[PDB]
Amino acid sequence: TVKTGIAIGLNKGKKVTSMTPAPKISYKKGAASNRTKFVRSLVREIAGLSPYERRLIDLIRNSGEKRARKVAKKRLGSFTRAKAKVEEMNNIIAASRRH
Amino acid sequence: AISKNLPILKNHFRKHWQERVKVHFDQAGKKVSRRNARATRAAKIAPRPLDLLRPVVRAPTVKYNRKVRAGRGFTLAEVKAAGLTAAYARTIGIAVDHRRQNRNQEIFDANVQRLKEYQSKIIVFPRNGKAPEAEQVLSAAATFPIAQPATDVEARAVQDNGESAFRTLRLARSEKKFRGIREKRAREKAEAE
Amino acid sequence: PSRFTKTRKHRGHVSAGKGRIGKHRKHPGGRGMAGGQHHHRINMDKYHPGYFGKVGMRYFHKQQAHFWKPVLNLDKLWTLIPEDKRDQYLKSASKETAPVIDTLAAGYGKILGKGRIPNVPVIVKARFVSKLAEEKIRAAGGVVELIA
RNA sequence: GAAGACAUUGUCAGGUGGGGAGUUUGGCUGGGGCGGCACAUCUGUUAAACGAUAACGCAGAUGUCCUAAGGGGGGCUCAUG
RNA sequence: AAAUAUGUAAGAAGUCCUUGUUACUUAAUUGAACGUGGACAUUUGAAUGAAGAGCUUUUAGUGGGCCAUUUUUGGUAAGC
RNA sequence: CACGGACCAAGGAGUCUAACGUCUAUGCGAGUGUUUGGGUGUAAAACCCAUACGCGUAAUGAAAGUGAACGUAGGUUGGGGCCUCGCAAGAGGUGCACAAUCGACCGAUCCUGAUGUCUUCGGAUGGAUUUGAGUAAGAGCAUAGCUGUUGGGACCCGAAAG
RNA sequence: UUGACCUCAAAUCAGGUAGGAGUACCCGCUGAACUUAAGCAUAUCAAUAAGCGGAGGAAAAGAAACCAACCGGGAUUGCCUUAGUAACGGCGAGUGAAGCGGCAAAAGCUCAAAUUUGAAAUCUGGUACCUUCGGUGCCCGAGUUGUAAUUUGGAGAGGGCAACUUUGGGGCCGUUCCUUGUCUAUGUUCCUUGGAACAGGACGUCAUAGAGGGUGAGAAUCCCGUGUGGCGAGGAGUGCGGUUCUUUGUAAAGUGCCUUCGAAGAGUCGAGUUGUUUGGGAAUGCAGCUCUAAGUGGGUGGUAAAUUCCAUCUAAAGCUAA
Numbered sequence A: 001t002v003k004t005g006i007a008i009g010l011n012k013g014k015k016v017t018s019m020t021p022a023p024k025i026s027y028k029k030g031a032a033s034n035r036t037k038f039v040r041s042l043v044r045e046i047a048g049l050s051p052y053e054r055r056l057i058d059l060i061r062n063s064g065e066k067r068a069r070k071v072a073k074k075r076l077g078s079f080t081r082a083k084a085k086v087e088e089m090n091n092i093i094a095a096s097r098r099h
Numbered sequence B: 001a002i003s004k005n006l007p008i009l010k011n012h013f014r015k016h017w018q019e020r021v022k023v024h025f026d027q028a029g030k031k032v033s034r035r036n037a038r039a040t041r042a043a044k045i046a047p048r049p050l051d052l053l054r055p056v057v058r059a060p061t062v063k064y065n066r067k068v069r070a071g072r073g074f075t076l077a078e079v080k081a082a083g084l085t086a087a088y089a090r091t092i093g094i095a096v097d098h099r100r101q102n103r104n105q106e107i108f109d110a111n112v113q114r115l116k117e118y119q120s121k122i123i124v125f126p127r128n129g130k131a132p133e134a135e136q137v138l139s140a141a142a143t144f145p146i147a148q149p150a151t152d153v154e155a156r157a158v159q160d161n162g163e164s165a166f167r168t169l170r171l172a173r174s175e176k177k178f179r180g181i182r183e184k185r186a187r188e189k190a191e192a193e
Numbered sequence C: 001p002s003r004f005t006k007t008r009k010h011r012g013h014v015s016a017g018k019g020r021i022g023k024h025r026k027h028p029g030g031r032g033m034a035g036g037q038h039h040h041r042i043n044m045d046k047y048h049p050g051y052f053g054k055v056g057m058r059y060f061h062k063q064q065a066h067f068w069k070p071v072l073n074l075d076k077l078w079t080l081i082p083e084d085k086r087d088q089y090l091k092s093a094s095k096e097t098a099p100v101i102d103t104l105a106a107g108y109g110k111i112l113g114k115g116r117i118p119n120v121p122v123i124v125k126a127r128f129v130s131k132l133a134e135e136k137i138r139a140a141g142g143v144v145e146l147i148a
Numbered sequence D: 001g002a003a004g005a006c007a008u009u010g011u012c013a014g015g016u017g018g019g020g021a022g023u024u025u026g027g028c029u030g031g032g033g034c035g036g037c038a039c040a041u042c043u044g045u046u047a048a049a050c051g052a053u054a055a056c057g058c059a060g061a062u063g064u065c066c067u068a069a070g071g072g073g074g075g076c077u078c079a080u081g
Numbered sequence E: 001a002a003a004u005a006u007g008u009a010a011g012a013a014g015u016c017c018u019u020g021u022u023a024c025u026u027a028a029u030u031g032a033a034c035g036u037g038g039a040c041a042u043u044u045g046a047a048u049g050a051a052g053a054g055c056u057u058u059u060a061g062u063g064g065g066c067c068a069u070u071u072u073u074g075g076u077a078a079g080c
Numbered sequence F: 001c002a003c004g005g006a007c008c009a010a011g012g013a014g015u016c017u018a019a020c021g022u023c024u025a026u027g028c029g030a031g032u033g034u035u036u037g038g039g040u041g042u043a044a045a046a047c048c049c050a051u052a053c054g055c056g057u058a059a060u061g062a063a064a065g066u067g068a069a070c071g072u073a074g075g076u077u078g079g080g081g082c083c084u085c086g087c088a089a090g091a092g093g094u095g096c097a098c099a100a101u102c103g104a105c106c107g108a109u110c111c112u113g114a115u116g117u118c119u120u121c122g123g124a125u126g127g128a129u130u131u132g133a134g135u136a137a138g139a140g141c142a143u144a145g146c147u148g149u150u151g152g153g154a155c156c157c158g159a160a161a162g
Numbered sequence G: 001u002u003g004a005c006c007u008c009a010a011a012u013c014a015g016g017u018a019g020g021a022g023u024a025c026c027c028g029c030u031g032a033a034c035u036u037a038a039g040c041a042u043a044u045c046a047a048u049a050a051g052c053g054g055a056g057g058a059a060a061a062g063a064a065a066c067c068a069a070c071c072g073g074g075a076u077u078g079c080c081u082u083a084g085u086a087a088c089g090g091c092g093a094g095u096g097a098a099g100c101g102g103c104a105a106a107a108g109c110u111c112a113a114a115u116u117u118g119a120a121a122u123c124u125g126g127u128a129c130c131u132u133c134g135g136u137g138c139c140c141g142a143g144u145u146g147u148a149a150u151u152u153g154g155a156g157a158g159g160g161c162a163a164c165u166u167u168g169g170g171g172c173c174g175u176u177c178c179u180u181g182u183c184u185a186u187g188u189u190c191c192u193u194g195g196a197a198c199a200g201g202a203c204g205u206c207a208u209a210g211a212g213g214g215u216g217a218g219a220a221u222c223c224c225g226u227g228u229g230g231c232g233a234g235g236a237g238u239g240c241g242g243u244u245c246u247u248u249g250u251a252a253a254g255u256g257c258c259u260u261c262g263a264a265g266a267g268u269c270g271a272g273u274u275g276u277u278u279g280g281g282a283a284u285g286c287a288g289c290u291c292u293a294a295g296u297g298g299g300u301g302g303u304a305a306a307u308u309c310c311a312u313c314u315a316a317a318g319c320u321a322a
Helices: A036-048 A051-063 A066-073 A081-099 B029-045 B076-082 B107-119 B166-177 B179-183 C084-089 C133-138
Strands: B056-058 B068-070 C098-102 C123-125
Touching: A036 B107, A051 A066, A051 A081, A051 B056, A066 A081, B056 B107, B166 C133
Parallel strands: C098 C123
Antiparallel strands: B056 B068
């Protein structure tokens, strides 16, 4: 970044030799792990698809991805929740559906 | 109710505030009791300076970012930079802060010199029973004071170049104000077909 | 000292000097800013003109720290120079030997332009200044080293 | 035995809800009430030759109407006999 | 078309002379306004009076009024 | 021919506080404010103190933001005092405070829109029966008092009620 | 059919523990109206009084699902200030915090989630003995649906290399602390008044003691105490401070470097809505119902929304003095 050295502007402030902070593991809180990765793998096929999601995947194959997200937002909460979710379903389609 | 040229007063005494009152008559007693409990902790804390070695740091926001202040700990990177470990620095009286980071080399060397000055001041007693008498100081903060880093020399030569400074600001303002629209323009321009 | 109070001079006068035709009856015009728009409206318009009503745009969660910018026109300025140094620097006004004045470290954000200054070369580092503040310094053969 | 994914219970939503709750239920005023408006107004008078001046004093009007019944110019002269 | 009431004026912040400014005004430094310099003393521009004149702050009480003379409205009139 | 008052004693009613305006006293004075806290002590006193922070020293905008000398910090009338001449009467110089007044300056608003420019930024200079709680060789800070204010049980006693 | 196991039982079963009180303060819940608004319904009063449940010597809080936007800061708490401000409010009456700063005080941490697996290493009880706030032995039982060791995000773990640093636990007596006990100067001289001397007057006294109280009136000096310390008693307590008993330990820990990893809490988070409260305003929190996630994700960034970024913390689990 490097502050332009002055009071206002895009990089407002004094520029005193950056020191590259330590790599705190906590920033990597949302860790994946070959463990959980493979754990959630099983559980998904074990428990299967949750009934509101059946309506969801079919929702796509029928009216489309756009309309399904509208229903995924009126299902979960945040919009991103829905996009991440819908995108996750095409991963489920791509598998069983094709190869 | 409302008469004369008097300035509108907002006194919030409509509640039964007469039961939440706290006249500090104990102001004196508190002081003494606070100095004795402090002077007794010292005659139990043995030769240690009550308070540990508090670090130098630079206070936040547009306002105080020009005043270096006695922080809290010492980051785990600066203790390894001093040579000793944190699981040890606390047992020696060198206040350590795990969550504080380090993005300023000046503040950094300011603390490692603050730690070197101190590792050459401590009179650690090994767990034997010899106990080499070295009296007891009463202030770790008094012994290692803080002096805002020397910024510039009182005098220097006048280096003019005709930037006006006032213009460098006014412009720098606009460059931040229209950075966006000008960024969308280079977006709606690089989009030639 | 309740000893000099006028109530001492009102003992034995009957109405404690609060009149006997209108007395001192608890709260006659309501309480506090009561009936501001009603009966006490004349006392408002004049004495408190433009009291009722909204005006600007609201700034939800405003830290005053974001605004700190204590001004300091040139009128003073030479006052951020210790008594002694001032004498020396003033008379022996010359480049190379220009005093570096740190307005920020002094406790001032902006530098304005008021009571002129002695035709002397001066380095004035500040967070931000006025147009005429820098124009007055530039005539005294001085710079404006912007900081933050 | 009857009953059966309906009842029920829970959550929101519409209806009902003086059974109940809270409260309000102008002023002036020859007592109040009714009537009125003297309550924002305007013409003349009362008003006592400056101005001001009251009564539920007197005689009336207003909440509108006007793209001309506004603005400018030209020509003209009205009611009545 | 009175009487009683009522506005103003009765000077130096003036009047007279002179001639300076202007982005106003005029056909025109014509004129307006405002000055430079100049002339003019209390018989300096009526009477009378003046326990000073001018000025700001702040604050109490009061915001039921009533009577008389004369004018005057209602009202038979009323200590209305 | 309104009400309280049979008589005496002792109770008995404009208080305290937070914040304020005026005025005055005092310290200091572009500063002021030690008393949160720390140092100290004969110890709730007294005395000593760092840093902050408060108010002030700059206003103005709704805000982004901008921010106070054409000149001896201006012209004019008036000004106490002081000064020069004069026995005096006065005449002239100087005129602070303050008053009126014409200006200049800083922000607001409405206009002007220069050299330049990431061709839309920039915003010089110049205007306006426009505006402001402004500048124009600072006066504030604190403490105490009278008086007044507000919130308070709030001068003392008193409802029917909720 | 005999013994399991799971669950449910069962007792005047072995041992425990709970209630009630107090309730200044603390922790929640519940919850008003008088009152202010000159009326009154929003609001206010007030997230108060009353009601109810629950603790301690403090409680709670407490190590970041924070503040921030800085050159960043760095648990909490309290105080000065922020500020009667930002903000909320029939934008009426009114109400009204936060970050920064200074200071007081400082304290840091621990579990789940890992093949101990060449070895349950774990603990309650029972009983004997004992050197007992327990130990040891043995026997039950708990327990593999998980107790020990290991690691808690600051990290840290496995394998590998290479060396180095560091000890632990009991007595006894000083000290530290709580309660304490006793000893510790100085006239009862003279005259006067008086019922009485502690009053007046004269002469002295000790004074680290002229605080106070008592005594037949104002008593330092009579009495107790006061002052200065002295010296004993009984506990607490190993804070420390010397000595003495044990070397506990192919015991554990920390440190460097290589590499592969590194699990991190869901009917929760968040959203919709309802009520509610807050200064919080397209919603501060809390709660009810309904939907109900993810993993370089999630929360947060005080104007809802989409897109693109950054900063910043690591929830939904826990402990802790001042």
